């Protein structure tokens, strides 16, 4: 029994947090 | 542009100046050698970096050294 629809959607929303922080770090390193 | 330096071991044989295909080098008065002249590189903006001058230099080690640097249109030898 693999993960459900809600778990996949939750992982997508959670992955936004490292996504935005990756952008912040990349732009900071560009300075 | 490339950087062309002339060191004190130059013997003033004028061979580097004759070998230059873009007239970067000229011979100037000097007193450090019997020929009483030394190579100079006043026009390094026209230097392409072919290193023909180093090939022509008879001293050991080279009295003239070319250091390839920032590339421009004329240093890349571009007719376009």
């Amino acid at each position: 029994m693999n993960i459900s629809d809600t778990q996949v959607f939750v992982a997508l929303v959670v992955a936004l947090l490292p996504g935005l922080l990756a952008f912040r770090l990349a732009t900071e390193l560009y300075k | 542009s490339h950087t062309v330096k002339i060191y004190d071991t130059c013997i003033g044989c004028t061979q580097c100046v004759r070998a230059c295909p873009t007239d970067v080098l000229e011979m100037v008065p000097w007193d450090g050698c019997k020929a009483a002249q030394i190579a100079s590189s006043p026009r390094t903006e026209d230097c392409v970096g072919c290193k023909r001058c180093e090939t022509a230099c008879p001293t050991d080690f080279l009295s003239i050294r070319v250091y390839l640097g920032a590339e421009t249109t004329r240093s890349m030898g571009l007719a376009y």
């Binding site: - | 330096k5 071991t9 873009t22 007239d23 011979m27 100079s40 007719a79």
Partner: protein, 139 residues
């Protein structure tokens, strides 16, 4: 303005390009004792006129090759001059810079990019870290 008659040439594919009209162009002028056939720097043969000639070339190396290896070495013509022409019309004569050919020593020429040591005494790059000075440029 640069005066002279262009050599007889039927056209070629190795002539000037957009760079001549946009960034810079070069012109080589010389005087010949007779009408004779020479080789264009970018391929093909052209006929230089009886009087004084004027040739437009894309690169400075073309003028040094034509004037140095053909005009002087082959046709015994020693009065060729190379000009740099800008799109705005400004023209400066760049070869020979002071009227004397560079291979012949001329008084009043300063020493440019001369290092007062043998090449083996250049400092190690570790000594010049974070200073922006190359070993060959070190005092």
């Amino acid at each position: 303005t640069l005066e002279g008659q262009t050599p007889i040439f039927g056209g070629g594919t190795g002539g000037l390009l957009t760079k001549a009209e946009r960034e810079e162009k070069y012109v080589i002028t010389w005087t010949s004792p007779k009408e004779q056939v020479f080789e264009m720097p970018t391929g093909g043969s052209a006929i230089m006129r009886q009087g004084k000639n004027k040739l437009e070339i894309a690169r400075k190396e073309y003028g040094i090759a034509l004037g140095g290896q053909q005009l002087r070495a082959k046709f015994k013509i020693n009065d060729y001059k190379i000009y740099r022409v800008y799109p705005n019309g400004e023209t400066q004569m760049i070869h020979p810079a002071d009227g004397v050919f560079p291979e012949k020593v001329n008084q009043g020429r300063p020493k440019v990019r001369y290092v007062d040591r043998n090449i083996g005494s250049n400092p190690s790059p570790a000594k010049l870290k974070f200073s922006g000075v190359q070993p060959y440029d070190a005092p």
